Design a binder for this molecule. Structure first.
Ligand SMILES: Cc1cc2nc3c(=O)[nH]c(=O)nc-3n(C[C@H](O)[C@H](O)[C@H](O)COP(=O)(O)OP(=O)(O)OC[C@H]3O[C@@H](n4cnc5c(N)ncnc54)[C@H](O)[C@@H]3O)c2cc1C
Ligand SMILES: Cc1cc2nc3c(=O)[nH]c(=O)nc-3n(C[C@H](O)[C@H](O)[C@H](O)COP(=O)(O)OP(=O)(O)OC[C@H]3O[C@@H](n4cnc5c(N)ncnc54)[C@H](O)[C@@H]3O)c2cc1C
Ligand SMILES: Cc1cc2nc3c(=O)[nH]c(=O)nc-3n(C[C@H](O)[C@H](O)[C@H](O)COP(=O)(O)OP(=O)(O)OC[C@H]3O[C@@H](n4cnc5c(N)ncnc54)[C@H](O)[C@@H]3O)c2cc1C
Lengths: 593, 592, 592
């Protein structure tokens, strides 16, 4: 009979308060412009169908995909070179959610949709891009094999192999399949140690003929993402019968291989290690040593870079989607959080300074958003055989410009976004820093900002009059400006003036370069930034002029995008070659030689 | 007898090539502007002493500290609530290299130099900040307790407690010590669940009087870094004899406590958990449950906020140091890499696009670097009693401005830097991403960009003196311009034009009728950025114009900073209340 | 044009050789004695049903479960106190394969089979234990909640609560279900800091009446496994209306609770931490702080201990299953390996020393295996109402004996087994060490070897009936001996001689004068081992003597078990009180 001690067992008191975090709303319904943009680009019959599918998928993002993608971050891939008995197996361990995510992509047709023969090509790419844009920031980086997979189908089909070449026909069918138990994905192994940007100088993989169009590959692939994929595309240097190869782009042939034989065993490949990455941690990225890998030559010998170009538009568009996804997502989470976090006696949402900051992020995102859907429209026209000459040229211009500009927007924007949450933004267990770490891949891979900026110049250097064509496209967009609204008129005038300046500078540049004292490369980024802003601005304007869909916000946005920041930031003197000498004196001041 | 099988055992061949990564060079010698800046600011005999100490420390950084900081990232702090036998212990497990870093801070006087009696305060804060600046990007986040440590010293001293108050006097003395065996660090525990930033409205810790000036604390600290520190400052509401307290700022009193007791046992504190952080992973940051932690009140009752205000200038300066450290570091690594990485047949260093990219990063860095040293200058003066009115006012203005601007430059700059490395910049095992993850703390803690922008507005609202003095300071800097140089001249004009326009807009927004339709808080960031750019611009001109040290890069950077990006980005129509409504519509379009 | 470099990219060569590891064969078909034992014990039509179900499950074990169990070791449970936003949640993170294992338990009726109304209880517990035995070494410790689950069913039923008590009836029904979507598991939270084993003196949990039969619990559970269960049984002291309670066994009442509420939220419970365990790493074991956990009292007030006593037989049987599972498993793997590993020019299987080592392990395993099935037999009989006096008494005696003996055989046996593999037996990635680390739980939990040895003594002290009945049971087994066989005959004699000597020593120790100078607790283990060996011996003889099933190995094993190691290791002089003094001196020599 002692005194009871119930009182001596008691949970810790912590004050009662804890902050409610942000809510992810249905990302199709909650998106500011996506639905409206679709109202305008698609025909009525197709809009209903597409909206319904996307809106439903929105609900799957919130109830299922988000959680899956999160788990893929929490349970990262591993590699075991060996089993326990001394046997080399290169076992890749990836979590169930990654696999489930690949299956949802199949079921949801994230690839299929972009190729469905019963649907108009222009419709389907716009549907697909909208779907990828809902998926991407919840994807746990399954978005990356989706991109390479789309790019693979694209490449194999542009080379006219589907129906004719055994493995490519099978690949195409499987890569496009909506059957989760049949569907394939693809990798893409271009980057090597000596160069990634530079494939003609970097690639030291060699192909020895076994028989006919079947070769052995031997080389080292320095980044190879999604090694759980079923097939891959890669470049290599065919070895002629005297044991020799060609340097440069002219040495490179293109090959398709199955990653694993029918026994589940690696096909002449050893995984040297998995990368330890700032972000995309969900994604297994390996270094590969090829040593006898059996592969099939596709496309013409020495025509390897040409072969894979066929997919540029694709991959880059997907990359842009990712960038934009991160941007939209942080805004979406931020603004929601803004209705719940009390500071100095009211919700963040009430403080002018807070809304100013977010509004500017909105403005910039909308611009690029519409640039993205222009790209998707254009790709689709091109795939239908219905491109005007101008639309064909715009497709070639817009893709690198889009990838690099959205690319460069993304980290600063997402960085600003997480700061909206204060300290919480910085805590990995909220899910928010993932968005930053993963966003930062987007300006780096598939071409850095500056390498793509050169690609933009190389688009110009090819020469049907890209620039004139750029001019006409802009003019079309400006032609139905609601000039009666004072702000849209001013906007139209800003875009117009900027276009006119850019033309003048590039005309000037083009003349002066034989004289030696002019280096257009040096300002390639500013050039590419300018095109993006002009193009994006024109689209916002056209968008805000459709009063069947436009609201007031659309008008404010067009105005702010066009007139409250420079459309062109580019000066003649930055072209001067002397400028380059000044550049290096600055950079290399006191550098220890 | 059998055929040998030496051929069957063979390492893998992987092609012979692998890329040389970047070299970290002596960061005092390699820095493009730090030596020249010190040359101008210090009298020659102090410069010589200071340079030699830093040059040497540069070597210690490449030979030792860098590696130490890297290891503190590779071996992150852990926390164990219980020992194995049911005992609550809260064991904080932190790697040896963290500890070693703390001792190097003592050995190298990273705190001491700033308070050395026998050196002039001017000299000494310049020297200190320079040293803090070399240290910071190699510190594995030991930079953070150093900041909190310096702030603690400043706070304790400014309250006139040295000599009088036993614990604060022991604290000051140990926080400043060069003896690794004795030196102390401090934490600072303000932030709680309901508010960081907003401490007046978010602080829900309570202090019950034990005897005279000794209290027990009960509350929950939501972020508390360097829980391996020895002392900490913190705020709490004293509970009266009806068992009641005061809401708002007026309730809060400031307290000093020892973290652990003579026994190594936590003083009424539990560690609930360590934070899982994007960056500053080296640094142990915990949540703390205070339940009878024994603490000495310092400063006056209900004057807790004022009390810790004395340390702002210093904390903020340290923060800016961090930002700039990352900026300088990435540029330094990248430039080096650029002489080693071949792309299309040449090293990156020969591609104009690549150096265009870098030059612009350099330009912006230098502007802020000088801004940093002007703050250091102004702080040292303040502490010597020699400040003019102008200079006293500039210390108040520059500190929040500097922190927020450098803070907001840092992530986009470091992001661009890691992109110079291509895919390798994205690999954690290079050490490069750490720079970015760690840089991202800087615009967030100790006030977000926008919160500090509001502070900037408080500094000058509605006190016309502050901006006129900014005016005067700018003119002092510009009056030295080598106007013979066309670029410096245009530069000067640009600064003039911008300063003017700024002053006009703020006068106009001050108009007591204009105000109904006018929200200046809305553009607080633009305002603060403009101040930043104008100040920094002017400082770059002054620097370029000193012929005893400047070179041609100096002129060129000054020209670019001032004339090739707007110094003022601020329009009258952005002050309109109506605009706010438009902002909201844009932001909450389709919001569900 | 350049010279190709295909020769410069080449995998490493490592000599061509690597050892084939062991194969897990269908563990029902491969088992040397399980099928024959079932053949003898079950009527043919039940055997046929049972074998087919097990044979099939054998395949499911090699094709699926094994891999699942391995994964539950590779992906250990984790616990998160807080979510990211300051909320206390106690999230238990356990791998998919654990969950999958639990569903296979439901699908395969690992609990259901033991309670199936339409099958005879005799049959069904034999079938169940057989199934438990195939499952156990592949279960990734899901075996543990299965034991606690079966014990819960038995307890709830034996208290005559099925039909009457709402929660217990729902519980019983869900614990027995084959529907993965509905099936439940149970925990059992007895052990506290002051005592496991000693619950009467160590339980410091308190139950305050809410209403009628519903109470709130406040206390600290020091070990609580399978916190992913749905319900749990536990003991606590009811607090009276003076706010007082009863020390000792009499205070304790037994309670039934739901672990989480309709919302998935813990019922007044926090998880303080998960244990870091030598083995059973698959299994989530936590320490629990009960603070207002809502619970239904079941059984009578102060009858908590009696209440849970009904489940001992069953829990103990499950434990022995585990021990034997590990023993069988290692032997099975090792023998296989032995047909694949060449040492000095032959497979290990051809080296007599190697097979001598294994034979002795086999001999001992089989003895205990039969002991296990005799327990199963006796349990099923008890539950059918058909037990003779002898058989009722043998159930009580055999259960602690079986658990402790198998428990003490297991680590040294599995240790010898892993040594058969040489260095590979010491490698975690083979899966083999898991066997040893997991086996080591078995002599420790649910009573240590010595604590259960004291229970064995309680079973028979001072109740002369129990040993006479052991006597009778042994004679029943021996009366069937094929005495025509010289080995079985000698065997029989050995058992006789030993049983006799045992009975004499215990009579002698019972002498009320002898007792002053006599400590029987001192030799409790020897006593219990002797009972074990005698019982098992006799069972091996009986088995060997059934010509319809036995083979020559059976005879030989029986002979070796009985005649090649002492069945009794127990001398009269070890009972002496004086001896105790000598024991202490030896043990505490130079103790400081
Ligand atoms: C790694 C780390 C370690 C830390 N360590 C410590 C430590 O040791 N000690 C300590 O005291 N603190 C520490 N902190 C606290 C840090 O200072 C806070 O996180 C900071 O106050 C940011 O605010 P918050 O976290 O309370 O978020 P909140 O202030 O809730 O939200 C910030 C957001 O609200 C906005 N906002 C707030 N007020 C206004 C306004 N009036 N007008 C417009 N917008 C507004 C901001 O602009 C920002 O977007 C740490 C933080 C981090 C990330
Ligand atoms: C997470 C991740 C996953 C990846 N997965 C894959 C994959 O599955 N398959 C694959 O093939 N690749 C993959 N990559 C590789 C990626 O495409 C390369 O990183 C990219 O090609 C850049 O190449 P690099 O890393 O060699 O950069 P480098 O080109 O060595 O360096 C880039 C820097 O050099 C500058 N530069 C380069 N050329 C020029 C020039 N001509 N003029 C001026 N400046 C120039 C760039 O602007 C940039 O600053 C991956 C990368 C990452 C980060
Ligand atoms: C992995 C694991 C999980 C567990 N999970 C649970 C669970 O879910 N629920 C639960 O209730 N319990 C659980 N237990 C508790 C387990 O039954 C106890 O650990 C057990 O009671 C052993 O005793 P103890 O831990 O209290 O040690 P103690 O009993 O303090 O010490 C045991 C030692 O004392 C000796 N000893 C004790 N009494 C005597 C005596 N009278 N004479 C001579 N020697 C004596 C024993 O022989 C032994 O040497 C778990 C244990 C483990 C290891």
């Amino acid at each position: 009979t002692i005194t009871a001690r119930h009182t001596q067992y008691s949970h810790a008191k912590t004050g009662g308060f804890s902050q409610t975090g942000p809510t992810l709303h249905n990302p199709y319904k909650d998106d500011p412009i996506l639905d409206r943009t679709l109202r305008r680009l698609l025909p009525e019959s197709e809009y209903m169908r597409v909206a319904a599918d996307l809106s439903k998928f929105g609900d799957r993002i919130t109830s299922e995909v988000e959680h899956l993608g999160r788990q893929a971050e929490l349970e990262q891939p591993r590699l075991e070179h060996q089993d326990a008995w001394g046997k080399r197996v290169d076992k890749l361990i990836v979590c169930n959610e990654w696999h489930k995510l690949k299956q949802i992509c199949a079921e949801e047709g994230v690839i299929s949709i972009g190729y469905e023969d019963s649907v108009d090509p222009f419709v389907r790419r716009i549907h697909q891009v909208a779907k990828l844009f809902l998926f991407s920031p919840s994807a746990g980086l399954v978005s990356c094999p989706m991109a390479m997979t789309d790019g693979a189908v694209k490449t194999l089909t542009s080379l006219n192999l589907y129906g004719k070449h055994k493995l490519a026909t099978e690949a195409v069918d499987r890569l496009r399949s909506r059957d989760p138990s049949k569907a394939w994905t693809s990798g893409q192994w271009m980057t090597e140690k000596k160069g990634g940007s530079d494939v003609a100088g970097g690639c030291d993989t060699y192909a020895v003929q076994i028989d006919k169009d079947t070769y052995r590959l031997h080389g080292y692939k320095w980044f190879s993402s999604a090694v759980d994929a079923d097939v891959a595309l890669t470049l290599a240097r065919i070895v002629d019968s005297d044991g020799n190869a060609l340097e440069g782009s002219r040495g490179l042939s293109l090959f398709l291989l199955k990653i694993r034989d029918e026994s589940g065993n690696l096909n002449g490949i050893q995984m040297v290690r998995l990368k330890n990455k700032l972000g995309t941690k969900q994604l297994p990225t390996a270094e590969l040593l090829l040593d006898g890998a059996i592969a099939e030559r596709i496309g013409d010998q020495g025509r390897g870079v040409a072969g894979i170009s066929n997919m540029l538009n694709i991959t880059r568009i997907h990359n842009a989607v990712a960038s934009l996804g991160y941007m939209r997502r942080i805004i979406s989470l931020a603004r929601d959080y803004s209705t719940k976090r009390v500071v100095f006696g009211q919700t963040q949402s009430k403080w002018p300074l807070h809304t100013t900051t977010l509004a500017k992020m909105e403005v910039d995102t909308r611009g690029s958003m519409l640039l993205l859907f222009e790209a998707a429209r254009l790709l689709g026209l091109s795939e239908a055989g219905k491109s005007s000459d101008v639309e064909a040229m715009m497709l070639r211009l817009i893709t690198p410009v889009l990838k690099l500009y959205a690319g460069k927007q993304a980290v600063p924007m997402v960085s600003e976004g997480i700061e909206c949450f204060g300290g919480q933004g910085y805590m990995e267990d909220t899910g928010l820093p993932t968005l930053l770490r993963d966003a930062q891949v987007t300006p780096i891979w598939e071409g850095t900002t500056n390498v793509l900026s050169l690609d933009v110049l190389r688009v110009f250097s090819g020469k049907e009059n890209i620039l004139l064509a750029f001019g006409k496209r802009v003019e079309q967009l400006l032609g139905n400006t609601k000039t009666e609204d004072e702000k849209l008129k001013k906007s139209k005038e800003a875009v117009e003036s900027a276009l006119k300046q850019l033309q003048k500078l590039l005309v000037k540049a083009s003349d002066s370069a034989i004289q030696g004292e002019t280096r257009i490369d040096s300002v390639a980024r500013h050039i590419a930034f300018t095109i993006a802003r002009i193009y994006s601005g024109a689209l916002l304007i056209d968008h805000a002029s459709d009063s069947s869909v436009a609201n007031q916000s659309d008008i404010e946005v067009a105005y702010r995008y066009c007139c409250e920041q420079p459309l062109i930031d580019l000066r003649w003197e930055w072209f001067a070659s002397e400028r380059v000498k000044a550049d290096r004196e600055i950079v290399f001041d006191n550098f220890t030689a």
